């Protein structure tokens, strides 16, 4: 039996989001890619450095906003710009969100030497696609 990135049926009480409810064979049929850059296009360079950056950014944001992220990040690259789109929860105070946005945007711009923006979308609770 295949295992890769499959949430397995339980007793019908496990809430899954739309992203985690779709197995890998749907990545270009029902769900899209969580990162969009040019590295993996034909004749394009630096796929390796883009990949390492994505892995770091996903871990940095998970620990920088502990318990706030409601779903996976969407990493966007346009030219020199890096745009991080995060769906967060409405539990942490707004003051603390603004502090962390100013802190993460500055710290990441100096680390990867590019203009970095963080776009937060707040949800009251995790969006449940189905109960498995």
């Amino acid at each position: 039996k295949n295992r890769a990135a499959r949430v397995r049926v339980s007793k019908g009480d496990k809430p899954v989001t739309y992203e985690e409810a779709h197995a890998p064979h749907y990545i270009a049929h029902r769900k899209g890619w969580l990162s969009l850059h040019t590295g993996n296009l034909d004749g394009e360079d630096h796929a390796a450095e883009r990949t390492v950056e994505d892995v770091f950014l996903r871990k940095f944001m998970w620990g920088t906003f502990p318990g706030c992220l409601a779903d996976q990040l969407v990493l966007k690259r346009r030219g020199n710009q890096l745009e991080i789109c995060a769906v967060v929860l409405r539990q942490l105070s707004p003051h603390k969100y603004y502090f962390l946005v100013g802190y993460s945007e500055t710290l990441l711009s100096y680390f990867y030497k590019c203009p970095v923006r963080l776009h937060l979308q707040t949800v009251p609770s995790k969006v449940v696609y189905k109960y498995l």
């Binding site: 019908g12 009480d13 809430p15 270009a28 049929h29 029902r30 769900k31 899209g32 109960y131």
Partner: protein
């Protein structure tokens, strides 16, 4: 007292859409429809559903192969599933005499058809298909069994077989859908004329990875040129030349047409097969309709779909497996 851990809000929580909710969704679509017209710089008053779909496709470009996963902006009536209304009032008395059956819609229909048959008894096709089950369930907004569907269709057939009145025939036609039968009639190419006024018909053919374009002249001596070369030179193998002769021989027109074809790709046999198809389709312009039908029934006008099958991982070939060792 030992406290049994109490159940939370039902996790499944099947979503029900009340009629007020649908009404609020319709208002949102109408207001959203006016913004979408304003965004695209079109008249709010003549903005149709086909313009909405075109605008949404441009604004939210999605390459997802499955169209049901792409962003959609449709009227709530077409999006949300059709839900049956409440069948009982505040007093609690259901509204239908067949409510307690559980299939008031289905059994009410069965009752009606049986009644019509009784009255008819006391008084005394190709295009139309009987409504399928999934589509009948939609009309009745009820979940039916396969055997229930059979029973219902059998009763309609009994109604149709017996003589019917104006009204009974209309009722039957409610449950008949339209089948558009595709015609298996070859589409003739448009006869063209060259600079000298000689009739000709260009066509295309395909076999495996080969692709041929054939120009068949209405009148000729039987000369065939492949890529500018006489056919016996371009096709030294006799089998290939036999394939070139099959279209003209079958219609008994050897020596009466001049062909000039260009074929690229594939091997010698595939190229001959591609040219055969191109020539046959072009030659249909000059033969009669009946002769064209015979050509189709003889196999001369069908594109052969048999193409090379890919190799699968873990196997030696497309179907060939690696040697199996029981022990």
């Amino acid at each position: 007292a030992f406290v049994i851990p109490k159940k939370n809000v039902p996790t499944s929580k099947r979503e029900t859409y009340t009629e007020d909710f649908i009404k609020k969704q319709i208002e949102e679509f109408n207001i959203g429809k006016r913004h979408l017209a304003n965004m695209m710089g079109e008249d709010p008053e003549t903005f149709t559903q086909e313009d909405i779909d075109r605008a949404i496709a441009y604004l939210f470009p999605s390459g997802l192969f499955e169209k049901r996963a792409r962003p959609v902006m449709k009227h709530p009536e077409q999006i949300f599933p059709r839900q049956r209304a409440i069948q009982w009032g505040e007093d609690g008395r259901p509204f239908h005499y067949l409510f307690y059956t559980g299939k008031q819609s289905y059994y009410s229909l069965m009752h009606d058809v049986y009644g019509m048959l009784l009255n008819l008894e006391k008084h005394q096709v190709i295009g139309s298909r009987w409504l399928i089950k999934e589509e009948l369930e939609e009309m009745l907004v009820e979940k039916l069994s396969d055997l229930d569907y059979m029973q219902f269709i059998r009763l309609l057939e009994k109604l149709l077989t017996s003589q019917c009145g104006a009204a009974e025939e209309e009722f039957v036609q409610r449950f008949r859908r339209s089948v558009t039968l595709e015609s298996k009639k070859q589409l003739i190419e448009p006869v063209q004329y060259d600079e000298q006024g000689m009739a000709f018909s260009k066509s295309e053919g395909k076999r495996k990875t080969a692709k041929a374009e054939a120009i068949v002249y209405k009148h000729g001596s039987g000369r065939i040129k492949v890529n500018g070369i006489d056919y016996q030179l371009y096709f030294p193998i006799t089998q290939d030349r036999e394939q070139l002769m099959f279209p003209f021989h079958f219609v008994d027109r050897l020596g009466k047409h001049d062909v000039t074809c260009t074929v690229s790709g594939g091997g010698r046999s595939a190229q001959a097969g591609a040219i055969r198809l191109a020539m046959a389709k072009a030659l249909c312009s000059f033969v009669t309709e009946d002769e064209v039908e015979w050509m189709r029934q003889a196999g001369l006008l069908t594109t052969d779909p048999r193409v090379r099958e890919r190799k699968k991982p873990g196997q030696e070939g497309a179907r060939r497996k690696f040697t199996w060792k029981k022990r």
